[PDB]
Write a protein that binds this ligand. Structure first.
Ligand code: CDL
Ligand code: PLX
Ligand code: 3PE
Lengths: 121, 174
């Protein structure tokens, strides 16, 4: 477990307060559109299994499918973005606080670097 | 013709002997040439005159793109992706230009062979030496880089060649 037991972590909290400082996902997010597509597919499959007209029947039910998927997808995307931002924050903090473990290296040009040549023949 | 550069594509001056007939028989070649000029050359000349008159009314121009020089892979730092990209693109353009230079020299060689005809082995010795030198340099540059060639690989090959030359010079001086 990498980020389990992280200091200051409140248990059973889907989205902490520190996540409010990150940019929320746009409503036209391609991931949100894909979640809505999944909801629409679920509605179509529901109509197919219940032997209703797949495309025409149950418009309210299909709309509820799409809406529920979009809602949960928006919150899931918020949590995913928060976790990735937290990972980057921790990585940068560790790199900064361990300079002897992460030292800068002198940059040499390819005019100085000697690379062996392997002819293709 | 001013279409191409006479210096880049040289032509020896054309020496055509004058006719010196020895018989009273008419020349069928001359008669057929007169017929050809009367029946074909004049109509095609008039057609081209009309076409060029149409072209002169709508004159417009196109240009030759100029590329400024950019730092090469020797100057680029290690894993400096932008400099590596610029250097690789420049190296590819130079490779294309060198290929076309070799093509120009080969065209010179072929034209001189055909022109000199039965005395080509002697009169085309100048164009054979230029082709030999150009092809030697081009081969030393891009001989066996491979399908996935690059400026880095060409630089490694040049470094290997320079090391071999330095070792040979040191051994000779020893
Ligand atoms: C549309 C492209 C989708 C691509 C994939 C996307 C993901 C899946 C889609 C979601 C689920 C869709 C519904 C599934 C059930 C369909 C049942 C059916 O009959 O459907 C016919 C139905 C119309 O018929 P109906 O009158 O309602 O009822 C007739 C009976 O169902 C007649 O039924 P029957 O009694 O004759 O049933 C017999 C039939 C029953 O067969 C079926 O029911 C086949 C479909 C169900 C199988 C599984 C579907 C996929 C589920 C997810 C799995 C992964 C998918 C991706 C896989 C990729 C790799 C393959 O069985 C057979 O024929 C057996 C032989 C074949 C078996 C072997 C082949 C199996 C292939 C499995 C994979 C198929 C992938 C594509 C599926 C596309 C389905 C439309 O048409 C559709 O459902 C069309 C799809 C919806 C179109 C909406 C259009 C909206 C307006 C335009 C929008 C334009 C774009 C919007 C943007 C803005 C533009 C301006
Ligand atoms: C103050 C007044 C307002 C309070 C607001 C409420 C505060 C939050 C309340 C949360 C609900 C109350 C508790 C109910 C159970 C909590 C469940 C959830 O919230 O907890 C989180 C758990 O969240 C879920 O794990 C995320 C659900 C993600 C669902 C998708 C999984 C990803 C699948 C990948 C493919 C995705 C496909 C698309 C899916 C539709 C983190 O809790 P944690 O104590 O730390 O878990 C310990 C175990 N660990 C450490 C190993 C994780
Ligand atoms: C009726 C049948 C059931 C299917 C309903 C499909 C539509 C459901 C959503 C209706 C509209 C809801 C809404 O307000 O969406 C707006 C929102 C984006 O709004 P916003 O980003 O604020 O505006 C632009 C700002 N730059 O938009 C979003 O956030 C996008 C979320 C929805 C993504 C949908 C993906 C496709 C779903 C299936 C479409 C099927 C179309 C054909 C239906 C034929 C029915 C016979």
């Amino acid at each position: 477990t990498m980020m389990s037991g992280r200091p200051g972590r409140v248990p059973l909290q889907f989205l902490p307060n520190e996540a409010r400082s990150l940019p929320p996902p746009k409503l036209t997010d391609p991931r949100l559109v894909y979640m809505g597509f999944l909801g629409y597919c679920s509605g179509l499959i529901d109509n197919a299994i219940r032997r209703r007209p797949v495309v025409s029947a149950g418009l309210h039910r299909q709309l509820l499918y799409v809406t529920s998927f979009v809602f949960f997808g928006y919150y899931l995307l918020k949590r995913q973005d928060y976790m990735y931002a937290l990972r980057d924050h921790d990585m940068f903090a560790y790199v900064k606080s361990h300079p002897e473990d992460f030292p800068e290296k002198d940059k040499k040009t390819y005019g100085e670097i000697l690379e062996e040549f392997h002819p293709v023949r | 013709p001013d279409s191409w550069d006479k210096d880049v594509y040289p032509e020896p001056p054309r020496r055509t002997p004058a006719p010196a007939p020895q018989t009273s028989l008419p020349n069928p070649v001359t008669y057929l040439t007169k017929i050809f000029d009367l029946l074909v050359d004049r109509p095609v000349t008039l057609a081209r005159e009309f076409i060029e008159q149409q072209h002169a009314k709508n004159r417009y121009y196109y240009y030759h793109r100029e590329f400024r020089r950019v730092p090469d892979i020797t100057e680029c730092e290690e894993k400096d992706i932008l400099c590596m990209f610029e250097a690789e693109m420049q190296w590819r353009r130079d490779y294309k230009v060198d290929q076309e230079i070799v093509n120009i020299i080969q065209e010179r060689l072929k034209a001189c062979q055909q022109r000199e005809g039965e005395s080509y082995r002697q009169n085309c010795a100048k164009e054979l030496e230029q082709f030999t030198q150009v092809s030697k340099a081009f081969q030393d540059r891009y001989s066996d880089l491979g399908a996935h060639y690059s400026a880095r690989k060409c630089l490694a090959k040049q470094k290997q060649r320079m090391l071999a030359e330095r070792k040979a010079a040191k051994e000779a001086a020893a």
